[PDB]
Amino acid sequence: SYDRAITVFSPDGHLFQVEYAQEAVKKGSTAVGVRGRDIVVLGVEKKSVAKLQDERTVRKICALDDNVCMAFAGLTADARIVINRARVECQSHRLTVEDPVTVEYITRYIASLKQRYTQSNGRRPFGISALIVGFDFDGTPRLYQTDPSGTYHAWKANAIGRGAKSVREFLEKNYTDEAIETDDLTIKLVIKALLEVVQSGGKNIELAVMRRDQSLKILNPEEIEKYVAEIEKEKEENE
Amino acid sequence: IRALDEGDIALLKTYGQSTYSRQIKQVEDDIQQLLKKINELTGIKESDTGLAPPALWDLAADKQTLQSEQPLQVARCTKIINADSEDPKYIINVKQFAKFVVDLSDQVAPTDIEEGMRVGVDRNKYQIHIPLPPKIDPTVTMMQVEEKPDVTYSDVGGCKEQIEKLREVVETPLLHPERFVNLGIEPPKGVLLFGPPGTGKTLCARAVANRTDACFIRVIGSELVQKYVGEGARMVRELFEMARTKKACLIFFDEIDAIGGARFDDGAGGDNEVQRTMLELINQLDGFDPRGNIKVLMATNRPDTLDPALMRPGRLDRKIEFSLPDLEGRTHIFKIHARSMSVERDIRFELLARLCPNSTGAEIRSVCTEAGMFAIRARRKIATEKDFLEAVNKVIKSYAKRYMTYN
Amino acid sequence: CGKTMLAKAVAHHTTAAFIRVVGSEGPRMVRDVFRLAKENAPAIIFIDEIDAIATKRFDAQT
Amino acid sequence: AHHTDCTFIRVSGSELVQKFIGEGARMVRELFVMAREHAPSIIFMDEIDSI
Amino acid sequence: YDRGVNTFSPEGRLFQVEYAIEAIKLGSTAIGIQTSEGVCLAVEKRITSPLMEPSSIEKIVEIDAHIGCAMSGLIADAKTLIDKARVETQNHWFTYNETMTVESVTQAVSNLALQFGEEDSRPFGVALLFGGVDEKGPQLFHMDPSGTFVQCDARAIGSASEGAQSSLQEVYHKSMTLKEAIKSSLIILKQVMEEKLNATNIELATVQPGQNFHMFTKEELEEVIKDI
Amino acid sequence: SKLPLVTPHTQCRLKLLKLERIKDYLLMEEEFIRNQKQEEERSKVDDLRGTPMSVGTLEEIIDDNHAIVSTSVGSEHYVSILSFVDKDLLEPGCSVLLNHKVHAVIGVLMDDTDPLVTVMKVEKAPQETYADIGGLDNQIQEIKESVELPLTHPEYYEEMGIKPPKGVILYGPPGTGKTLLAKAVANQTSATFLRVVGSELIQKYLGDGPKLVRELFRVAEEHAPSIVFIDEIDAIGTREIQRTMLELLNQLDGFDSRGDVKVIMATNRIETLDPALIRPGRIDRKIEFPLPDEKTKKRIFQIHTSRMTLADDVTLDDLIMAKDDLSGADIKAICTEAGLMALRERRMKVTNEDFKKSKENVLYKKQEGTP
Amino acid sequence: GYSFSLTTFSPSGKLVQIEYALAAVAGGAPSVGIKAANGVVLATEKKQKSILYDERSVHKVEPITKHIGLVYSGMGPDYRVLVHRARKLAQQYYLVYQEPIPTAQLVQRVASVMQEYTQSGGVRPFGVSLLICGWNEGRPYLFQSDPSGAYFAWKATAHGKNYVNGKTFLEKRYNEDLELEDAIHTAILTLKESFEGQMTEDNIEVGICNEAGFRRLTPTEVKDYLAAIA
Amino acid sequence: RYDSRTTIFSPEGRLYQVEYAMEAIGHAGTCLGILANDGVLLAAERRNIHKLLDEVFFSEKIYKLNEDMACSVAGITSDANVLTNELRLIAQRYLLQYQEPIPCEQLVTALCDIKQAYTQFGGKRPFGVSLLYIGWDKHYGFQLYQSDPSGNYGGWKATCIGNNSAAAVSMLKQDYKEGEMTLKSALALAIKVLNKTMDVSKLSAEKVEIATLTRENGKTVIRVLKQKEVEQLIKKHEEEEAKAEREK
Ligand SMILES: Nc1ncnc2c1ncn2[C@@H]1O[C@H](COP(=O)(O)OP(=O)(O)O)[C@@H](O)[C@H]1O
Ligand SMILES: Nc1ncnc2c1ncn2[C@@H]1O[C@H](COP(=O)(O)OP(=O)(O)O)[C@@H](O)[C@H]1O
Ligand SMILES: Nc1ncnc2c1ncn2[C@@H]1O[C@H](COP(=O)(O)OP(=O)(O)O)[C@@H](O)[C@H]1O
């Protein structure tokens, strides 16, 4: 009894289709999220504006809350679908619940949606993983990751996509146990990670910052290039 | 871009050279041609022949025997006419040559010649004079072990009950037939060994072969499985005949799962031929005619897969289970493997055994070896408990070797 | 209707040798019959009801 | 193949399939055996997309 | 006989949920001990990286202020089972005001587990261990994807459950104090499973009849580490 | 025998001097050979084996000097053995020279049968060396400890009482140098090298698979110090094919004593390998071949572009940089295609931009798929 | 091939089942529909297996509305279910908009239902090619719909057995300023070319749309055009 | 089999069926949205080639969603028809709810979302249609969008799909113009790319269908080009190639 399906198990017990969804996520581009001392930063790479293409339309970073934002890496159609579901869920929770939305609740909602979409015949699972950063952890920053297995986890800093194997080790190489003072330093570390882009140019990295109390903040290419220059100056110290 | 015009390659390979090009390529061509000249001058190398050390051989006896004796041809005997038993007459078959009616020589006797019997015969009269042994297939006769492995029962760890019960059948009746005969009991004649891979089944077979003292024949699945039909059955026939020739014999089948697969028909006939071979075997073990003093050993990793007729007692009388070693067995095998090494005297082996998960004896030998490589890579002439713990870690983590399906 | 009759009659009147294979009878067979045809220079090959093997090509599954 | 004076060897991908396991491997390896024994040569696989 | 549970093999065995037991096997282990002093659960995290928040992996959970749970297998299906157990306890207590017997919690979760070919998906590839207390006794229970459940005094589930179960069987008796049973569980998990104890990859949860608070063990493993 | 290895490769007079040294020596060979008994032994033996002598097969040996021999007509003859024939060199299946008239055994002929495995004996390792491979140092020490050190210096293991490791699997993405490392270790220790490519042991004939592996191990042990390489073991590794697996596993672990032959098995899909073939008892050494890092990539670029004429403007670092996206084979592809691109525009001295567009085009041809 | 299932794509992007339906089409009854300067003429044959079959009992040209005439490719029962659906759809449009259904719009709705049958894994499309003649706002319209759900406008066309000859015929035997009488003559001529065997009042039936109204020919008129003419 | 059902991934995670839908789009008639400012255009040459084709609508490729919205068609004919009807339905929903014109990106996302939902569920065949949108809205004004069967959508200033789509986008990136490249230059470039992609020497007027949106009175107009304007456009391009010849 090989896989051939979504709701049957291999003789050793593994469900192969969720693994195939994991591989489909692995095909996607890089996405490395972190949480700092107070702020959370994000940087997406491999924009690859195709001359006639205008980059803005694709919206590789999307915000669906009073304050929460990131896209979902993988197939962008499932990304837009889950974007619509996240909009609906966050607005409904804010309108219906006595208190506003929290990052844990929306992360659990997304995980449960993926699980309930997987747990049936004739229903293709969402082959997309995401990195959620929220503000209201009782006024603290925190980061979650969502996996098409309908699973959610809480990272201090995580990477998914084409560089998932690499950047994570990079994180394990230098994610400072000292909480990042001057969260601009954490943003510079994120820029250094984005220097490991699929094109590695660093001139088209789209970055977002949110200080756990602020709304969504977007970093323009020139000011992001300023942090890239600071990181390059730090790197040139080896002389 | 235009293609490389002949002038373009000319200038490409001319302008870009060093001022050395001509000399060193010409010198290389001289290398090649001088090599060929040396080869032709020295001639070809003498392939030679046998020709044992010169002082060992010849004597005029060699040529005298060559010019005096007869290069006898070999013929299948058949149908002793025995028309009057004063001169019996025989039929002979010279393979791919002919069939003759012949008589004995002045040397051989009628009692010395039987039907078939693969006799020899002269080259022009075709009179029969030599008793020759029957044709045993070479690919069957090389199967006899001819050399005992360097393993004893003391090298097998933990399986005291298994080795006792197997020696009860494969060793005790040969060593002490008196116990069985004076008590008037018939001992078992077939032992099957089953268990997970790497538990020591082939090691037990090696120990038995070392302590057998009788004719021991190993058997492997690939040996029996020929391409042509019936040929494997033929080899098993010859193998059992060979076993009958010996005064008692031991037959060992390693991984009999290769041939003993249960018979099935609906698969468009299935493998069938392998089933035919194992059917000839299932007859030879117990069919018409008593098997003889032939005690038989099979070891397999899939006991349930074999055909039920092969599991049947009277052909497989005693079935033995080699399970994963217990803590005491793990300690014992660790001792046994550590006997040969140069290690610390104070190695607390039972600690290592209780660090071991449900590890087969193959894993024990592997971790012992990994400690050996740790010591050697450290260039130390003594293996230490630290080396053993790194070996345990290496082996266990290697066997353990996204995985988000876990809890 | 006489396809095989008329092919046979043409072969008999001419110096040709008449080889015949029915389409219900893989590509190795086609190469073999063509090679056999080559062995006799004026030979004639006849395929009977070739439609079974010469049906329209699409994306084939099995 | 004609102009470069190298030998021409042709084996179609449809010819590669065969009805038995262990034959395509053998046939390809021995095809390159003829390729090497003929020395300067070109190997053609017409309709390699069939496999 | 591979499409689903609705097919019977010649030996009667459904060739779908044996793979569910094998899916129990692929998951990380969980240990449970039932003692007169208290019922305890131990759980291995199998932590991929220290950048992970170790508590984020919910392989040890609190069903209610009188019952905790550990489990092995698939984490999402386990979380669904845990959610049902919690809402069942909430509803039953809010309605009847009587404490939910842990066995009743197992019954409800098992009845959910019987919802793949019994109505109108697939078996829940996860096995659970419950440890709870009630007005009539402290209990430990185990259940599997098949929907069956059993009362156990010392149970091991997940990967390498055989060796840990053998050690747990050999060390267990009916008169252990919770301290000695806990310590035996920790030393067994240390020797067989991964390594020396640490707060990053192992978790403990104990339940006592008179203690509805602090159902877990947290930020106090230090006294263990030096004295283990 | 072969020529020495001249190890300048740039066109310099050092290369010349080495060459004319070699020419001097070969010319002395020519001189010496051009500037140019046992008739009793010959008159006895080579006249007893009166020409011509037929070639047949030995089947059985019955007496000290009596044996059964078949010939190409298929007939069977009980003949005598002359004393000069080495008895220990005679066994069933051996090719034997026979007197034409009286068919008497007059010597053993060195074997010229079993053609296929005779071809796969290759022994043609010397195209590479540990030199040709750069950066795979952990793998190098691992395989050295496993197979190379026991062959070169079994003294350490015998003194330690250690039975050496008896199986190695190499794994990793393709183009990482597993085959190169196997050939290189075959070159370092001149033990006979045996290579057999995966699926090629899968055969249509029912016996041919296990039979082929049996004869390959037979020839390997016949050569005694030997290394056997099975690349893409996955083709077999992942009843008949399982029976070939059983044959190989038993040839590894099973009865008899194997001795000195070492086994290297290379796979691209190690995780798909069946548990049986990965024997903890036999296969204790699994060597991963990761995609090369920055240092390893730099080493491979230097190794491959070393033999090419290079311009000054080539900045190797921008080629090395980005990530571990590719393997050594891809690096060789970039070097080769950069050579062709320099050739088209008529450079015999490749430049930096050549490598830049070469890596760009390779990355274009690397993988595919709709966005 | 990829024909046993209707709801899947082939590697080349073809859904083989619907061209199988189109192969069922053009294997059925031959028929030709042309557009004249004033009106639209659709002609189809009536030839059964045996003389017992009273052919007048089964009309093939059916008036969807007094201004719409409909002909099919030969798939009888599928044509009947589809023509019932088309009649009901035309009635819905006639009552909703209080105006008669446009010919192009009617064909659009019919092809929409056709497409509705081109999905799921337990149904099959009606392998029928539909020729629709109509009058709308003083303009004549001839449309063709096919089981794939597609529809197109033809000045002249034909389908059924031997349809390529009808295509060539309407290629060289047509001009857009044909009068109605000459249009019917062209239709019966291409019917003669496409059909095998002679025809009488029994063997053909024709429907003509004129801007005042549509009407199916009486067999006597069908013989008047087919016999004693051409 | 993996490729038989849309809900099964490859072991690499790729989906075969939507890929087959794109290779289907490979057969589609060449059609592009051209690069224009202060205006936009959707040229779509008709693959329909036969004398007796009536083309009574005079438009079968470009469909007007509203006087500020037009869409192109490249895919399965019936799927395209039902999809265009669904576009008009969704625009009607948005307008009836808000009494405001729908933004380009919102409508495009809505259609692509329902397409993805249809592809996601089992027992249903993915819509083998890719399409282009030309529109003007409050938020961004002139916009051209491209959408695929998978439900992916994006913004392109100049793009082409259908027959030789890769070649078309290639020469569009070759002689790419920006800024002062107004609507008339867009017509010229569209004529150039259509003559290059199509095999017809002296490309015929009836073979090509062109439409364009321009902001008149702030209420906007979408004009589908009639025969005459296409005629002198093609003739002017022919004499422009003649002028390019005159340079030699
Ligand atoms: N109980 C044991 N005592 C000593 N050595 C053992 C034991 N079990 C396994 N080994 C070692 O591991 C190897 C096991 O091989 P074995 O299990 O006999 O192969 P197979 O499973 O094919 O019969 C032996 O070579 C032996 O050296
Ligand atoms: N025109 C014919 N005249 C006489 N006999 C015929 C004719 N056509 C067919 N037959 C008979 O039919 C038999 C088989 O015909 P065959 O040549 O196989 O026709 P086809 O090739 O069309 O099947 C012949 O034995 C022959 O007697
Ligand atoms: N570390 C390396 N050093 C030098 N060459 C390498 C290296 N890795 C790969 N190569 C190149 O790749 C090829 C070997 O690929 P390899 O990985 O051995 O194939 P396989 O995957 O079949 O074992 C050789 O041509 C070699 O030049």
Side-chain angles (χ1 to χ4, degrees), chain B residues 20 27 50 52 58 62 71-74 96 118 123 135 198 206 220 222-223 258 365 394 398 401, chain F residues 13 16 23 60 74 76-78 83-84 86 101-102 160 214 243 250 254 256 271 279 281 285-286:
Chain B
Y20 299 17
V27 167
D58 191 77
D62 279 16
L72 311 186
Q73 198 150 230
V74 188
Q96 311 89 29
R118 193 203 176 195
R123 214 163 61 157
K135 172 45 68 185
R206 276 201 259 255
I220 317 304
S222 87
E223 323 270 29
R365 165 181 40 68
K394 203 167 185 308
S398 173
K401 185 171 45 48
Chain F
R13 197 166 330 282
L16 267 55
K23 331 304 301 294
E60 313 170 29
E76 272 278 77
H77 312 275
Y78 165 89
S83 63
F84 45 71
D86 305 59
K101 264 302 281 173
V102 294
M160 201 45 20
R214 213 155 59 267
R243 193 174 301 106
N250 77 47
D256 191 344
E271 201 56 278
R279 215 82 187 272
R285 316 245 68 174
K286 47 190 67 42

Side-chain angles (χ1 to χ4, degrees), chain B residues 110-368:
Chain B
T111 56
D112 217 3
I113 311 305
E114 302 63 26
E115 184 149 26
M117 165 38 220
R118 193 203 176 195
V119 283
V121 75
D122 73 69
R123 214 163 61 157
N124 278 77
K125 183 178 179 180
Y126 303 88
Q127 182 187 121
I128 292 284
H129 33 88
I130 180 160
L132 301 167
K135 172 45 68 185
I136 295 167
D137 195 333
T139 174
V140 190
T141 175
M142 50 43 58
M143 210 159 318
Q144 195 294 307
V145 65
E146 198 77 30
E147 198 283 334
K148 312 230 148 198
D150 193 3
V151 174
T152 72
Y153 296 117
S154 39
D155 309 293
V156 187
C159 297
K160 162 177 286 291
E161 208 73 12
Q162 288 81 346
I163 60 149
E164 167 179 319
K165 289 216 287 185
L166 69 74
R167 288 179 82 183
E168 275 189 328
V169 187
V170 309
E171 179 178 297
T172 317
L174 267 274
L175 156 73
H176 292 150
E178 61 273 27
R179 302 166 179 238
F180 308 82
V181 70
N182 72 355
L183 203 59
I185 88 171
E186 273 282 339
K189 283 162 39 60
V191 190
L192 156 54
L193 273 36
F194 65 105
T199 170
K201 303 177 297 293
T202 311
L203 191 74
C204 296
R206 276 201 259 255
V208 168
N210 176 275
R211 271 305 316 262
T212 291
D213 158 75
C215 179
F216 186 100
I217 313 190
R218 61 170 184 301
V219 156
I220 317 304
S222 87
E223 323 270 29
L224 298 106
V225 184
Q226 299 306 93
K227 171 62 177 19
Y228 294 150
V229 289
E231 188 79 313
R234 221 201 91 262
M235 311 166 38
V236 184
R237 302 184 201 115
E238 286 100 43
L239 169 163
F240 265 87
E241 297 143 15
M242 173 172 350
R244 259 92 66 72
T245 68
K246 322 299 184 176
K247 152 272 167 185
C249 171
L250 257 300
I251 301 310
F252 167 57
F253 298 84
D254 189 11
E255 197 75 298
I256 202 44
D257 186 38
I259 311 99
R263 274 117 80 211
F264 70 105
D265 173 36
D266 59 344
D271 69 78
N272 223 290
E273 181 58 30
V274 203
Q275 297 179 188
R276 299 186 197 109
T277 309
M278 63 71 50
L279 267 201
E280 171 296 351
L281 161 53
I282 190 55
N283 167 57
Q284 285 306 315
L285 268 184
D286 155 22
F288 210 95
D289 155 48
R291 194 205 301 166
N293 271 69
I294 296 322
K295 338 290 282 193
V296 178
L297 265 172
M298 281 86 88
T300 176
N301 304 310
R302 302 191 197 126
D304 35 12
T305 306
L306 295 319
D307 185 283
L310 192 49
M311 331 295 308
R312 152 161 101 70
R315 301 195 179 103
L316 276 196
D317 325 331
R318 193 173 279 195
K319 300 184 180 63
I320 220 74
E321 179 29 53
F322 290 99
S323 57
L324 36 80
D326 49 356
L327 215 30
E328 159 61 18
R330 289 203 284 266
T331 61
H332 187 199
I333 185 189
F334 257 116
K335 306 311 179 63
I336 284 155
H337 283 344
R339 303 171 298 91
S340 309
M341 340 193 189
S342 183
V343 293
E344 317 186 288
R345 293 296 80 62
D346 295 351
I347 301 294
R348 296 177 306 295
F349 290 107
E350 65 93 16
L351 305 192
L352 308 170
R354 69 214 318 176
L355 315 184
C356 288
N358 316 343
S359 57
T360 89
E363 272 146 315
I364 304 307
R365 165 181 40 68
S366 75
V367 54
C368 291

Side-chain angles (χ1 to χ4, degrees), chain H residues 2 15 22 24 46 55 65 73 77 94 98-99 101 105 107 112 146 154 175 197 203 240 243:
Chain H
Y2 296 162
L15 172 42
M22 322 146 175
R46 316 180 188 94
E55 66 166 330
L65 312 181
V73 156
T77 318
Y94 191 101
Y98 291 111
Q99 315 271 0
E105 219 179 328
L107 175 59
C112 297
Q146 47 81 14
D175 58 2
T197 49
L203 171 65
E240 182 141 64
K243 163 167 55 76

Side-chain angles (χ1 to χ4, degrees), chain F residues 132-134 136 174-180 231 268 300 304 328-329 332:
Chain F
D132 315 44
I133 152 190
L136 284 167
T176 37
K178 306 161 306 309
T179 307
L180 192 160
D231 188 18
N268 267 308
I300 310 315
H304 273 322
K332 150 177 308 192

Side-chain angles (χ1 to χ4, degrees), chain G residues 3-13 15-31 33-47 52-55 57-134 138 140-188 190 192-194 197 199-206:
Chain G
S3 191
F4 306 146
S5 176
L6 173 62
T7 178
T8 184
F9 258 142
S10 85
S12 70
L15 173 163
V16 152
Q17 180 61 215
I18 178 64
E19 314 66 23
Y20 276 24
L22 290 155
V25 178
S31 175
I34 74 180
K35 197 216 302 187
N38 34 39
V40 195
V41 186
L42 314 183
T44 191
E45 60 61 14
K46 292 182 52 49
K47 278 207 265 252
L52 311 147
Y53 300 73
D54 170 40
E55 288 200 330
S57 77
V58 286
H59 302 82
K60 295 172 60 169
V61 182
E62 284 298 330
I64 308 308
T65 75
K66 195 270 291 173
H67 270 219
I68 296 289
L70 190 35
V71 170
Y72 62 117
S73 74
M75 198 26 52
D78 299 36
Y79 163 64
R80 218 195 316 94
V81 63
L82 209 31
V83 73
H84 253 280
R85 302 312 96 160
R87 296 189 148 158
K88 88 159 49 184
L89 280 160
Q91 204 140 339
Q92 316 167 233
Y93 190 103
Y94 161 73
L95 52 82
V96 163
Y97 294 70
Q98 96 211 69
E99 310 151 81
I101 182 151
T103 319
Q105 287 228 74
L106 169 56
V107 178
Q108 287 178 332
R109 282 55 174 258
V110 172
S112 82
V113 191
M114 261 195 178
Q115 184 277 327
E116 169 216 29
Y117 274 71
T118 60
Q119 53 55 55
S120 192
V123 299
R124 71 141 207 268
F126 0 72
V128 184
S129 184
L130 272 297
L131 288 174
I132 310 94
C133 53
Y141 295 86
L142 183 140
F143 274 42
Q144 149 277 294
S145 76
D146 293 317
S148 56
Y151 74 101
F152 311 100
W154 298 90
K155 326 169 179 55
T157 187
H159 54 195
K161 280 310 308 168
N162 180 12
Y163 66 106
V164 289
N165 254 281
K167 298 313 300 201
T168 64
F169 192 103
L170 300 180
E171 276 153 15
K172 43 73 184 156
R173 211 81 55 87
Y174 177 77
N175 62 6
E176 43 264 29
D177 62 358
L178 271 162
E179 301 283 357
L180 221 36
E181 216 67 13
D182 283 328
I184 318 143
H185 298 104
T186 305
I188 50 194
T190 180
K192 176 48 56 182
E193 160 204 42
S194 316
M199 301 76 88
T200 56
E201 35 268 71
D202 165 336
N203 304 9
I204 88 163
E205 84 165 37
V206 181

Side-chain angles (χ1 to χ4, degrees), chain F residues 302-327:
Chain F
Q302 310 160 249
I303 287 162
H304 273 322
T305 73
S306 59
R307 311 295 326 288
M308 314 160 36
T309 71
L310 260 296
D312 317 327
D313 58 5
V314 54
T315 70
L316 270 81
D317 88 84
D318 51 40
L319 309 172
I320 301 151
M321 61 66 58
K323 321 311 311 174
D324 50 48
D325 311 306
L326 70 161
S327 79

